[PDB]
Amino acid sequence: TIKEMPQPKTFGELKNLPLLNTDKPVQALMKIADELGEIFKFEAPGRVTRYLSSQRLIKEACDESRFDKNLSQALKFVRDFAGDGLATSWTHEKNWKKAHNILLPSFSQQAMKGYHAMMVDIAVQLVQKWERLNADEHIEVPEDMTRLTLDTIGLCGFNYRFNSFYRDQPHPFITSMVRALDEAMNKLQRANPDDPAYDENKRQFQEDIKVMNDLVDKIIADRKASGEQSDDLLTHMLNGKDPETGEPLDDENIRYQIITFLIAGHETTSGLLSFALYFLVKNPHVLQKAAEEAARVLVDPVPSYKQVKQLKYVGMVLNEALRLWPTAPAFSLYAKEDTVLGGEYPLEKGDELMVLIPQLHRDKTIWGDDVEEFRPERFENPSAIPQHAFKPHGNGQRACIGQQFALHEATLVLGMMLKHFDFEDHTNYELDIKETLTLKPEGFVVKAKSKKIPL
Ligand code: HEM
Numbered sequence: 001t002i003k004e005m006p007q008p009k010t011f012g013e014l015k016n017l018p019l020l021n022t023d024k025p026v027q028a029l030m031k032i033a034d035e036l037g038e039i040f041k042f043e044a045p046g047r048v049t050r051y052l053s054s055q056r057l058i059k060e061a062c063d064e065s066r067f068d069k070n071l072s073q074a075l076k077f078v079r080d081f082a083g084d085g086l087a088t089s090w091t092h093e094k095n096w097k098k099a100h101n102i103l104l105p106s107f108s109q110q111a112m113k114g115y116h117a118m119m120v121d122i123a124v125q126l127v128q129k130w131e132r133l134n135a136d137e138h139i140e141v142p143e144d145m146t147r148l149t150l151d152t153i154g155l156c157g158f159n160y161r162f163n164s165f166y167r168d169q170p171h172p173f174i175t176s177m178v179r180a181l182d183e184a185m186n187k188l189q190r191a192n193p194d195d196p197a198y199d200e201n202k203r204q205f206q207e208d209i210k211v212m213n214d215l216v217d218k219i220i221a222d223r224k225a226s227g228e229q230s231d232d233l234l235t236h237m238l239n240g241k242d243p244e245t246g247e248p249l250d251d252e253n254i255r256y257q258i259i260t261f262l263i264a265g266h267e268t269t270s271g272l273l274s275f276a277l278y279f280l281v282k283n284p285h286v287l288q289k290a291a292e293e294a295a296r297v298l299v300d301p302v303p304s305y306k307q308v309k310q311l312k313y314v315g316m317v318l319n320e321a322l323r324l325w326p327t328a329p330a331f332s333l334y335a336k337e338d339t340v341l342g343g344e345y346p347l348e349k350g351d352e353l354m355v356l357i358p359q360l361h362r363d364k365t366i367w368g369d370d371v372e373e374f375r376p377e378r379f380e381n382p383s384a385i386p387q388h389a390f391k392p393h394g395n396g397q398r399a400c401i402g403q404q405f406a407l408h409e410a411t412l413v414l415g416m417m418l419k420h421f422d423f424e425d426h427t428n429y430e431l432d433i434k435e436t437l438t439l440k441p442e443g444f445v446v447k448a449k450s451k452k453i454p455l
Pocket residue numbers: 069086087088100153260261264265266268269272326327328330331332391392393394395397398399400401402403405406
């Protein structure tokens with residue numbers, strides 16, 4: 001029953017590459033999937049991959065005995081500054097499992113309890129900023145969510161204060177990082193990346209890479225000279241020993257991990273919080289239900305770890321926002337051996353797949369006809385969701401190591417926003433999704449009305 005899979009329009013020797021010559025490539029690929037269906041071939045000079053959009057096929061792709069994590073071109077470009085950090089290493093590189101073993105305890109329950117007070121520190125700064133706005137000023141939502149999540153990973157993970165709420169402009173790090181990500185996206189469609197037309201891109205790229213590495217220097221310097229006794233992510237990087245190899249991380253890999261966690265540890269969580277607030281102001285009945293939970297649970301001026309764990313509906317709200325707009329919108333796999341996908345598509349060892357997560361999460365055979373609706377109650381019973389239908393944090397041993405960090409932070413912060421403010425979509429905002437490999441609303445603004453509840 002071997003089927004021929006469709007393929008979108010080609011451009012001679014450039015094959016499908018020019019389809020990525022857009023500022024919204026993921027959304028363009030979603031439109032192609034809409035037209036071609038659950039699987040389509042995508043070619044570029046010297047490369048082939050297959051975009052998967054159905055749970056039927058993705059549940060097979062998530063079989064770790066058959067498929068391993070692949071570095072997409074995007075991750076290969078990010079590797080130019082993230083090296084063999086956790087997110088851009090191959091599973092078979094020694095430094096992947098070594099750093100995984102060393103850093104997994106930094107995301108245990110007991111670790112999350114230790115981060116909680118510092119996430120409250122940053123969350124309170126956010127609430128205080130909004131309490132201090134004048135009448136009919138508004139909130140720049142992704143901007144402030146990025147302030148919050150960057151500051152949280154800086155403080156919680158590295159005892160470093162980016163002090164983003166003391167800046168009306170993005171931190172130097174954010175500016176360079178967003179620019180490096182821009183360059184990585186745009187480089188995806190460059191057919192001649194060594195054409196001298198991109199000499200300045202190359203120079204600017206190196207400049208943004210040095211900005212990010214300079215902050216890494218300072219984080220490392222302050223820690224090793226500090227006289228305070230810390231027990232955080234950086235402590236584990238500098239002191240942890242891998243049970244298997246017996247070795248700690250070396251200095252080069254530590255630097256890559258700091259870069260990795262500063263980027264991965266904030267950018268996707270700011271997108272999640274932005275999309276979540278978007279859906280809440282567009283769905284006031286949902287906002288009300290989550291606000292009622294927040295008021296009933298968050299009975300103290302400062303939320304506790306235990307209280308955040310009881311914000312179960314807020315948790316469902318976040319999962320439903322990750323369903324509709326997963327902020328790291330794709331991951332890539334390669335076939336470990338010859339194998340046949342879905343009884344219809346034979347693959348040879350080494351063949352690559354692209355999992356298009358926003359399209360998977362719109363599979364009507366899984367979610368029903370109301371798939372575009374925002375209904376957190378979809379997540380009331382994880383046993384009623386088929387396997388691998390919901391993959392916002394990737395798959396298997398290469399799934400997101402920061403999943404609990406992100407969800408604790410976002411649950412805490414959204415709980416506090418709903419406790420302390422009513423929100424108004426005063427511009428009737430039209431969703432506009434900016435792509436920087438990751439996804440985030442652009443230009444989303446709201447007004448908050450304080451409930452005047454003291455901190
Ligand atoms: C809602 C927020 C987040 C989302 C949606 C998300 C999503 C993902 C996805 C889909 C992957 C797999 C990438 C692949 O297969 O190529 C991943 C990997 C990873 N994420 Fe996240 N992430 C989030 C937050 C975080 C945070 C806060 C951190 C750090 C604290 C983090 C650290 C990582 C790391 C290190 C990896 C690589 C894991 C490994 O392969 O060992 N993420 N994330």
